[PDB]
């Protein structure tokens, strides 16, 4: 497998580096996250974890 | 006689194209179009029944 990055950091994609419901808390996240980062094969799962976040209102 | 529509009821029948490009069983199944009238009026037969409840 392969993984995502953000600034000084490298980390697995499928949960945010910021606290969950991260787009609702800090909506300008993409303006740090996605300058050249769109090339990552993990970006699809970073996106799913960021927006369809399974936020604290949901359950599994 | 007009009241013969007591004895008989509508039906579903197969239809070639219900709009989205697929065949269905349909309540508006269209049976024959007859166009004998030279003024260009059409008489259409359909699996509904209309003018009665």
């Amino acid at each position, epitope marked *: 497998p392969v993984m995502c990055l953000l600034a000084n950091t490298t980390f697995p994609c499928s949960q945010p580096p910021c606290t969950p419901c991260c787009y609702e808390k800090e909506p300008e996240e993409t303006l740090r996250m996605l300058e050249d980062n769109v090339m990552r094969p993990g970006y699809y799962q970073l996106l799913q974890a960021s927006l369809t976040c*399974s936020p604290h209102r*949901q359950r599994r | 006689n007009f009241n013969v529509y007591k004895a008989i009821r509508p039906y579903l029948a197969h239809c070639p194209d219900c709009g989205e490009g697929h065949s269905c069983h349909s309540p508006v199944a269209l049976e024959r179009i007859r166009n004998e009238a030279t003024d260009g009026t059409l008489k259409i037969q359909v699996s509904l029944q209309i003018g009665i409840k």
Partner: antibody
Amino acid sequence: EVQLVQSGAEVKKPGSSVKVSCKAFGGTFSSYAITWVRQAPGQGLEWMGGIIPILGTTDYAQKFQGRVTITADKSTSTAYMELSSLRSEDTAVYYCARDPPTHGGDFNYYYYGVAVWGQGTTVTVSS
Amino acid sequence: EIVLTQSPGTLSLSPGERATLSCRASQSNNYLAWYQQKPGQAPRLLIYGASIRATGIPDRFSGSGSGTDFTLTISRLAPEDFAVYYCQQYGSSPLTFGPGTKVDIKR
């Protein structure tokens, strides 16, 4: 996964209204087309001949209303269902807590990327 | 149109290994999905067919289709997998649920 809830079980008599309720939460502040499926005691899943997806019109399948009359509602996260003037055979478990049921052949279409199910609830139409 | 039909009308297996449930109709186009009912209890989602997968839970149960036919498999079915299984495609003049294929854990 979307979190799902219903009103508790009931006991009822024929010829009256039943005001069942469902709530769906985390996303879905407008219902993701959740639908009032129903199963008669111990049978295979012969389903609700009434309500299909709803949140703008009370759309049913091609069967009920003809024997017994049914409708549903579209409030924020909150999907009421009314079944009325019912009879003993309308005793069933009702599973509102269900996926989008995409209506192939007449209007518009729905997603895959998240699962959604949940519990059922019982109305006991009884003597 | 059609009415969905499931190929096993009964099945029975010990704890462990594998199952392969199956369902058919002369068309597909808009997703059917496979649902498991434990006795006395509400269904839950296992699979989507027609072209692409979805699930609620980790990949012990999984499935696929070809042409007219659609399938559901369970891996290491030792747990509470005594259940009846259904699928549906919802739309227009009737299409409806499958009949309910039942499989059990061989006491």
